[PDB]
Short mmCIF file of C-alpha atoms and ligand atoms in Angstrom, two decimals:
data_model
loop_
_atom_site.label_atom_id
_atom_site.label_comp_id
_atom_site.label_asym_id
_atom_site.label_seq_id
_atom_site.Cartn_x
_atom_site.Cartn_y
_atom_site.Cartn_z
CA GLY A 1 79.90 2.52 40.02
CA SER A 2 79.94 5.19 37.29
CA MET A 3 78.82 4.47 33.67
CA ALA A 4 80.97 5.68 30.75
CA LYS A 5 79.99 9.12 29.50
CA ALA A 6 79.03 9.78 25.87
CA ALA A 7 81.51 11.96 23.93
CA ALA A 8 80.54 15.66 23.49
CA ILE A 9 80.62 17.09 19.92
CA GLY A 10 81.88 20.32 18.33
CA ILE A 11 79.64 21.95 15.70
CA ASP A 12 80.64 24.67 13.26
CA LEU A 13 77.15 26.01 12.30
CA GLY A 14 78.12 27.82 9.14
CA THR A 15 76.23 30.20 6.83
CA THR A 16 76.61 27.90 3.78
CA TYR A 17 78.18 24.68 5.21
CA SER A 18 78.25 23.05 8.65
CA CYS A 19 80.88 20.62 10.11
CA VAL A 20 80.87 18.26 13.16
CA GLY A 21 83.81 16.80 15.11
CA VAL A 22 84.50 14.72 18.23
CA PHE A 23 87.67 14.52 20.35
CA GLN A 24 88.51 10.91 21.32
CA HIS A 25 91.80 8.97 21.95
CA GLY A 26 93.79 12.26 22.15
CA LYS A 27 92.67 13.35 18.64
CA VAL A 28 89.83 15.06 16.73
CA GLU A 29 87.77 13.07 14.19
CA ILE A 30 85.83 15.28 11.71
CA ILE A 31 82.76 13.16 10.96
CA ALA A 32 81.65 12.53 7.33
CA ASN A 33 77.89 12.36 6.65
CA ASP A 34 76.11 9.38 4.86
CA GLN A 35 77.14 10.63 1.40
CA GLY A 36 80.86 10.68 2.49
CA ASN A 37 81.06 14.46 2.90
CA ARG A 38 83.08 16.04 5.75
CA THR A 39 81.03 19.27 5.46
CA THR A 40 77.17 19.38 5.08
CA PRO A 41 75.26 22.26 3.32
CA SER A 42 73.25 24.43 5.81
CA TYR A 43 70.13 23.91 3.55
CA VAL A 44 66.60 22.75 4.40
CA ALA A 45 64.07 21.93 1.63
CA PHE A 46 60.29 21.46 1.94
CA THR A 47 58.02 19.41 -0.36
CA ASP A 48 54.50 17.90 -0.21
CA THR A 49 55.94 14.64 1.23
CA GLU A 50 59.28 15.43 2.94
CA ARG A 51 61.62 17.77 4.71
CA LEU A 52 65.21 17.29 3.31
CA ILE A 53 68.30 18.62 5.12
CA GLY A 54 71.91 18.99 3.92
CA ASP A 55 73.13 17.44 0.65
CA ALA A 56 69.58 16.17 -0.21
CA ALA A 57 68.21 19.75 0.09
CA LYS A 58 71.06 21.37 -1.89
CA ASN A 59 70.89 18.77 -4.71
CA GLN A 60 67.19 19.61 -5.56
CA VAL A 61 67.46 23.47 -5.20
CA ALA A 62 67.32 24.17 -9.02
CA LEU A 63 63.70 23.10 -9.47
CA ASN A 64 62.51 23.97 -5.90
CA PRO A 65 63.97 27.54 -5.31
CA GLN A 66 60.95 28.94 -3.42
CA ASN A 67 60.84 26.13 -0.80
CA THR A 68 64.59 25.52 -0.22
CA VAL A 69 65.99 27.65 2.63
CA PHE A 70 69.70 28.57 2.99
CA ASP A 71 71.53 31.54 4.71
CA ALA A 72 69.32 31.40 7.92
CA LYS A 73 72.46 32.52 9.80
CA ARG A 74 72.15 35.96 8.08
CA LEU A 75 68.70 36.33 9.71
CA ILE A 76 69.26 34.79 13.19
CA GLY A 77 68.70 37.23 16.11
CA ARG A 78 68.04 40.21 13.77
CA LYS A 79 64.97 42.53 13.37
CA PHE A 80 62.94 42.52 10.09
CA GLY A 81 63.60 46.24 9.55
CA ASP A 82 67.43 45.90 9.99
CA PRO A 83 69.08 47.29 6.76
CA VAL A 84 71.25 44.11 6.48
CA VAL A 85 68.04 41.92 6.29
CA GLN A 86 66.25 44.22 3.78
CA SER A 87 69.21 44.17 1.34
CA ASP A 88 69.74 40.34 1.63
CA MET A 89 66.04 39.57 0.85
CA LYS A 90 66.43 40.85 -2.78
CA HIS A 91 68.94 38.02 -3.51
CA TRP A 92 66.81 35.20 -1.95
CA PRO A 93 64.25 33.16 -3.94
CA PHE A 94 62.36 32.13 -0.74
CA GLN A 95 59.87 34.45 1.04
CA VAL A 96 60.90 36.30 4.20
CA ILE A 97 57.91 37.77 6.11
CA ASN A 98 57.49 40.25 8.99
CA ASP A 99 56.08 38.80 12.28
CA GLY A 100 56.26 41.51 15.00
CA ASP A 101 59.47 43.03 13.46
CA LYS A 102 61.05 39.50 13.48
CA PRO A 103 61.86 37.81 10.17
CA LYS A 104 60.29 34.39 9.36
CA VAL A 105 60.78 32.25 6.24
CA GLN A 106 57.54 31.18 4.57
CA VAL A 107 57.32 27.98 2.45
CA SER A 108 54.91 25.34 1.05
CA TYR A 109 55.26 22.21 3.18
CA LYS A 110 53.10 19.04 3.35
CA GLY A 111 50.06 20.70 1.71
CA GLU A 112 50.19 23.89 3.82
CA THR A 113 51.85 27.37 3.91
CA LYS A 114 54.21 27.31 6.94
CA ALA A 115 56.43 30.08 8.39
CA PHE A 116 59.57 29.34 10.46
CA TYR A 117 61.79 31.52 12.69
CA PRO A 118 65.54 31.48 11.64
CA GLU A 119 66.35 29.49 14.90
CA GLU A 120 63.86 26.78 13.86
CA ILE A 121 65.66 26.39 10.44
CA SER A 122 69.06 26.33 12.29
CA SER A 123 67.68 23.67 14.68
CA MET A 124 66.92 21.47 11.59
CA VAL A 125 70.59 21.83 10.48
CA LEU A 126 71.74 21.04 14.10
CA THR A 127 69.46 17.91 14.18
CA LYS A 128 71.28 16.65 11.00
CA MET A 129 74.78 17.29 12.55
CA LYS A 130 73.69 15.45 15.78
CA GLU A 131 72.47 12.42 13.65
CA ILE A 132 75.77 12.45 11.59
CA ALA A 133 77.67 12.16 14.96
CA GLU A 134 75.36 9.45 16.40
CA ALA A 135 75.83 7.34 13.18
CA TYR A 136 79.66 7.37 13.77
CA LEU A 137 79.57 6.93 17.62
CA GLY A 138 76.77 4.38 17.64
CA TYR A 139 74.96 5.96 20.64
CA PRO A 140 72.78 9.10 21.34
CA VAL A 141 74.69 12.45 21.62
CA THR A 142 73.46 15.11 24.15
CA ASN A 143 76.33 17.62 24.69
CA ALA A 144 77.72 20.14 22.15
CA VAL A 145 79.76 23.34 21.76
CA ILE A 146 78.42 25.55 18.92
CA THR A 147 80.46 28.32 17.29
CA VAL A 148 79.37 31.84 16.18
CA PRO A 149 81.12 34.81 14.44
CA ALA A 150 82.99 37.11 16.92
CA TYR A 151 80.80 40.08 15.86
CA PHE A 152 77.56 38.25 17.02
CA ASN A 153 75.71 40.27 19.72
CA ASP A 154 73.77 38.85 22.74
CA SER A 155 70.44 38.40 20.81
CA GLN A 156 72.28 36.50 18.00
CA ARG A 157 74.07 34.33 20.64
CA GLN A 158 70.83 33.58 22.57
CA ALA A 159 68.99 32.64 19.28
CA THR A 160 71.88 30.20 18.45
CA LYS A 161 71.45 28.55 21.95
CA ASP A 162 67.64 28.36 21.34
CA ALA A 163 68.29 26.54 18.00
CA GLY A 164 70.47 24.04 19.98
CA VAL A 165 67.70 23.52 22.64
CA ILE A 166 65.00 22.99 19.88
CA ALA A 167 67.33 20.34 18.32
CA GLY A 168 67.51 18.47 21.69
CA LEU A 169 71.14 19.39 22.34
CA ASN A 170 72.53 20.58 25.65
CA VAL A 171 74.62 23.62 24.60
CA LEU A 172 77.78 23.56 26.74
CA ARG A 173 78.95 26.93 25.41
CA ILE A 174 78.69 29.32 22.45
CA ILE A 175 82.32 30.05 21.37
CA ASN A 176 83.72 32.52 18.80
CA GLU A 177 84.72 31.01 15.41
CA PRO A 178 88.27 32.65 15.48
CA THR A 179 88.82 31.40 19.08
CA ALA A 180 87.82 27.84 17.93
CA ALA A 181 90.32 28.05 14.98
CA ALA A 182 93.10 29.11 17.45
CA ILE A 183 92.23 26.25 19.88
CA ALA A 184 92.45 23.79 16.91
CA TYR A 185 96.18 24.68 16.65
CA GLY A 186 96.71 24.56 20.46
CA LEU A 187 97.58 28.27 20.48
CA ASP A 188 96.12 28.54 24.01
CA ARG A 189 98.55 25.80 25.27
CA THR A 190 101.91 27.57 24.60
CA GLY A 191 102.27 28.64 28.30
CA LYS A 192 103.13 32.04 29.88
CA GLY A 193 103.42 35.22 27.77
CA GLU A 194 101.19 37.15 25.35
CA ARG A 195 100.73 35.94 21.75
CA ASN A 196 98.98 37.90 18.96
CA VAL A 197 97.12 35.66 16.46
CA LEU A 198 95.47 36.73 13.17
CA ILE A 199 92.65 34.53 11.80
CA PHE A 200 92.05 34.98 8.03
CA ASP A 201 88.56 33.60 7.22
CA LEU A 202 87.54 33.63 3.55
CA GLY A 203 84.08 32.04 3.09
CA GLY A 204 81.60 31.37 0.28
CA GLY A 205 80.00 34.80 0.61
CA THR A 206 81.96 36.80 3.25
CA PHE A 207 85.51 37.60 4.44
CA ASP A 208 86.43 38.11 8.14
CA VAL A 209 89.76 38.98 9.78
CA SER A 210 90.18 38.74 13.56
CA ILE A 211 93.09 39.66 15.80
CA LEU A 212 93.19 37.81 19.16
CA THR A 213 95.57 38.03 22.08
CA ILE A 214 96.26 34.87 24.11
CA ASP A 215 97.78 35.18 27.64
CA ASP A 216 97.91 32.05 29.89
CA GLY A 217 95.10 30.46 27.80
CA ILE A 218 92.84 33.58 28.16
CA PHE A 219 91.54 34.98 24.82
CA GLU A 220 90.78 38.65 24.10
CA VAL A 221 89.32 39.78 20.71
CA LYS A 222 91.52 42.82 19.81
CA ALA A 223 89.99 43.73 16.40
CA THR A 224 87.59 42.43 13.73
CA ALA A 225 87.37 43.66 10.09
CA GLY A 226 86.17 42.20 6.82
CA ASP A 227 84.18 42.48 3.63
CA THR A 228 80.54 41.32 3.49
CA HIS A 229 80.77 41.42 -0.36
CA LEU A 230 83.83 39.13 -0.91
CA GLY A 231 83.79 35.30 -1.01
CA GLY A 232 84.18 32.13 -3.11
CA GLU A 233 80.91 32.86 -5.03
CA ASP A 234 82.45 36.10 -6.52
CA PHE A 235 85.35 34.02 -7.96
CA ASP A 236 82.74 31.62 -9.47
CA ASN A 237 80.91 34.67 -10.99
CA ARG A 238 84.18 35.83 -12.67
CA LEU A 239 84.63 32.38 -14.35
CA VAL A 240 80.92 32.29 -15.43
CA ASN A 241 81.23 35.70 -17.17
CA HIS A 242 84.53 34.54 -18.79
CA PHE A 243 82.99 31.28 -20.23
CA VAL A 244 79.74 33.05 -21.36
CA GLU A 245 82.00 35.45 -23.39
CA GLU A 246 84.05 32.42 -24.66
CA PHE A 247 80.91 30.62 -25.95
CA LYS A 248 79.84 33.92 -27.67
CA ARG A 249 83.22 34.18 -29.50
CA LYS A 250 83.45 30.44 -30.50
CA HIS A 251 79.79 29.65 -31.45
CA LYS A 252 78.22 33.19 -31.89
CA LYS A 253 75.50 32.38 -29.29
CA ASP A 254 74.55 34.16 -26.02
CA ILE A 255 73.67 31.46 -23.42
CA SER A 256 72.99 33.88 -20.47
CA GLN A 257 69.13 33.54 -20.81
CA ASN A 258 68.88 29.72 -20.39
CA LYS A 259 68.93 29.24 -16.59
CA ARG A 260 69.80 25.50 -16.95
CA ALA A 261 72.83 26.27 -19.20
CA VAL A 262 74.01 29.08 -16.82
CA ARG A 263 73.52 26.72 -13.79
CA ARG A 264 75.41 23.85 -15.55
CA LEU A 265 78.18 26.37 -16.48
CA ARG A 266 78.39 27.75 -12.84
CA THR A 267 78.46 24.15 -11.35
CA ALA A 268 81.33 23.24 -13.74
CA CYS A 269 83.16 26.57 -12.97
CA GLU A 270 83.08 25.97 -9.15
CA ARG A 271 84.61 22.43 -9.71
CA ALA A 272 87.24 23.85 -12.14
CA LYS A 273 88.00 26.50 -9.48
CA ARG A 274 88.63 23.67 -6.94
CA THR A 275 90.85 21.67 -9.41
CA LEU A 276 92.97 24.86 -10.02
CA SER A 277 93.99 24.89 -6.31
CA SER A 278 96.00 21.61 -6.89
CA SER A 279 96.58 21.69 -10.71
CA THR A 280 98.08 24.41 -13.05
CA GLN A 281 95.18 23.90 -15.54
CA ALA A 282 91.65 22.42 -15.53
CA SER A 283 89.31 21.09 -18.21
CA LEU A 284 85.67 22.15 -18.61
CA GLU A 285 83.56 19.47 -20.41
CA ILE A 286 79.77 20.04 -20.71
CA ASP A 287 77.63 18.06 -23.20
CA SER A 288 74.77 19.87 -25.06
CA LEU A 289 75.15 23.12 -23.07
CA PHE A 290 73.03 25.22 -25.48
CA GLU A 291 71.33 24.39 -28.81
CA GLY A 292 72.85 20.86 -28.71
CA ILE A 293 76.38 22.37 -28.75
CA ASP A 294 79.00 20.58 -26.60
CA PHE A 295 81.21 22.90 -24.59
CA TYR A 296 84.68 21.34 -24.17
CA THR A 297 87.30 23.91 -23.08
CA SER A 298 90.05 24.63 -20.49
CA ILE A 299 91.36 27.37 -18.16
CA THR A 300 94.89 27.78 -16.82
CA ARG A 301 95.54 28.79 -13.18
CA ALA A 302 97.31 31.96 -14.53
CA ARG A 303 94.08 33.01 -16.42
CA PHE A 304 91.86 32.31 -13.39
CA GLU A 305 94.30 34.33 -11.16
CA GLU A 306 94.12 37.26 -13.68
CA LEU A 307 90.24 37.09 -13.72
CA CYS A 308 90.03 37.38 -9.88
CA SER A 309 93.19 39.48 -9.30
CA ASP A 310 91.40 42.60 -7.88
CA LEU A 311 89.26 40.43 -5.59
CA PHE A 312 92.28 38.50 -4.15
CA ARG A 313 94.23 41.80 -3.52
CA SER A 314 91.22 43.38 -1.76
CA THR A 315 91.58 40.78 1.10
CA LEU A 316 94.62 42.80 2.33
CA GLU A 317 92.57 45.98 3.03
CA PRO A 318 90.65 44.49 6.08
CA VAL A 319 94.04 42.95 7.26
CA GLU A 320 95.62 46.48 7.37
CA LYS A 321 92.45 47.95 9.02
CA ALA A 322 92.41 45.16 11.71
CA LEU A 323 96.16 45.79 12.45
CA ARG A 324 95.49 49.58 12.83
CA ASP A 325 92.42 48.88 15.06
CA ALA A 326 94.49 46.44 17.22
CA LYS A 327 97.31 49.13 17.30
CA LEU A 328 99.82 46.46 16.12
CA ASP A 329 102.45 46.12 13.38
CA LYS A 330 102.64 43.04 11.07
CA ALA A 331 105.94 41.89 12.73
CA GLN A 332 104.04 41.76 16.09
CA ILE A 333 101.70 38.95 14.85
CA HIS A 334 103.05 35.59 16.17
CA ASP A 335 100.68 33.19 14.28
CA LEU A 336 98.59 33.33 11.05
CA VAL A 337 95.65 30.89 10.78
CA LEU A 338 93.64 30.09 7.58
CA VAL A 339 89.84 29.40 7.76
CA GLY A 340 87.44 28.63 4.89
CA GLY A 341 87.76 26.55 1.71
CA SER A 342 88.63 29.63 -0.43
CA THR A 343 91.95 29.88 1.47
CA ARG A 344 93.27 26.82 -0.45
CA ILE A 345 93.68 29.18 -3.48
CA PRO A 346 97.53 29.40 -3.98
CA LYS A 347 97.44 33.09 -5.01
CA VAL A 348 95.46 34.06 -1.83
CA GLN A 349 98.14 32.25 0.27
CA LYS A 350 101.00 33.88 -1.68
CA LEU A 351 99.57 37.44 -1.26
CA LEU A 352 99.12 37.02 2.51
CA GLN A 353 102.54 35.37 3.05
CA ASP A 354 104.15 38.25 0.99
CA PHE A 355 102.27 40.83 3.14
CA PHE A 356 103.70 39.17 6.34
CA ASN A 357 107.26 39.03 4.80
CA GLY A 358 107.46 35.27 4.01
CA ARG A 359 105.97 33.98 7.31
CA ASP A 360 104.52 30.43 7.43
CA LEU A 361 100.71 30.07 7.48
CA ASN A 362 98.91 27.49 9.69
CA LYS A 363 96.91 25.54 7.11
CA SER A 364 97.69 21.91 8.14
CA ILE A 365 94.16 21.47 9.57
CA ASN A 366 91.74 21.58 6.59
CA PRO A 367 90.56 25.27 6.61
CA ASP A 368 86.91 24.22 6.10
CA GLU A 369 87.22 21.95 9.23
CA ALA A 370 89.42 24.07 11.68
CA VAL A 371 86.47 25.75 13.46
CA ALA A 372 84.64 22.43 14.19
CA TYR A 373 88.04 20.89 15.17
CA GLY A 374 88.56 23.55 17.88
CA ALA A 375 84.89 23.32 18.98
CA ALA A 376 85.34 19.48 19.52
CA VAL A 377 88.58 20.10 21.52
CA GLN A 378 86.67 22.57 23.79
CA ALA A 379 83.64 20.24 24.14
CA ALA A 380 85.80 17.41 25.58
CA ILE A 381 87.42 19.92 28.10
CA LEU A 382 84.01 21.29 29.22
CA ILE A 383 82.60 17.83 30.19
CA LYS A 384 85.61 16.85 32.42
CA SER A 385 84.54 16.31 36.08
CA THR A 386 87.83 15.21 37.73
CA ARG A 387 88.03 15.33 41.55
CA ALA A 388 91.42 16.47 42.95
CA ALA A 389 93.69 13.98 44.74
CA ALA A 390 94.88 14.61 48.37
N1 GBA B 1 90.08 23.52 -2.79
C1 GBA B 1 89.35 24.63 -2.97
N2 GBA B 1 89.85 25.61 -3.75
C2 GBA B 1 89.12 26.71 -3.95
N3 GBA B 1 87.90 27.01 -3.48
C3 GBA B 1 87.44 26.03 -2.68
C4 GBA B 1 88.08 24.83 -2.39
N4 GBA B 1 87.35 24.09 -1.48
C5 GBA B 1 86.31 24.83 -1.24
BR1 GBA B 1 85.03 24.39 0.03
N5 GBA B 1 86.27 26.02 -1.94
C6 GBA B 1 85.25 27.06 -1.92
O1 GBA B 1 85.04 27.48 -0.59
C7 GBA B 1 83.70 28.01 -0.47
C8 GBA B 1 83.05 27.46 0.79
O2 GBA B 1 81.76 28.02 1.02
C9 GBA B 1 82.99 27.71 -1.79
O3 GBA B 1 82.88 28.89 -2.57
C10 GBA B 1 83.88 26.66 -2.45
O4 GBA B 1 83.85 26.77 -3.87
MG1 MG B 2 83.24 29.60 8.72
#
């Protein structure tokens, strides 16, 4: 009569990391990739023999900086002359060129110089997320919901759909990232009456706050605010500067000019930063860091919290601006939702909870997975084709 339908998937197409989920048997499964990772880097690398996507691209970035592309989401649907694009290009090791006032990334690939539109790079990341899902389900996937930031305009939304089409996906809908995080908690299923929800999204490179109103499952974006220069990478930079100074004091050597030693220090700092979210102290053990000197040290959570103290406190400024813009008071917020891996930091949680006078934070769904979780919930609703009974 009627063949069983393939499951639809939910994709969080992130600036630095992407995540895929599927809703089946009344629950969401966040799908790990073939290296066992629940999130996949939004990186594409180009060589003379291969195109690598995800963890394989990110793991070879150190020696291939010119031909490894990341941050395509900062370029998608924008003009080459846009001041945002011009500033961002100074920080990128890959070439960004001007093709009719549209940015393109130019790399060496399979013996030739090749330029790609940002949507083409994003389609390569979406192809990887589709293959991650098909490896778990064991059949081809066609339908997907893709999320975008709430501030994305029409051009940015259309370029995201185009990336989906190039990847061979049928895009069911483009949904806002804060709306997807709210859906993950079922905040649109609480029935009649208005609810005000604040989504606190602290990423690798940016911070976004959104205030939504939910009335009978209908979402309205009331206010957005943030900081483009505040994320997990700034906390990593504070630890790097701390340990460079520490090596200087202990061994009377400045390591800051050996890229490999700085990179090995930064990699270790980011992992120590993660350990400090669960432990009160973390060890740093690097062999032959500089001039055959082993660097074995530690950092307490109290010292890390002091190093980043100004940065953590500055997350409350966009919260107050969003509340003024929404014309609401903090007591009028019904639910607080955490998004992004950097929200696992205990001090960040404490500051926000203290600001909202001890209120509980929704953090039960892994913050790096909440957006994809909500996108997978929506994807399963959008493919329903039930015919009413008499
Ligand atoms: N448990 C964690 N505690 C502290 N930080 C974390 C954690 N997990 C993740 Br993931 N991060 C950081 O989140 C950002 C995601 O782009 C990166 O800067 C990661 O370092
Ligand atoms: Mg995100």
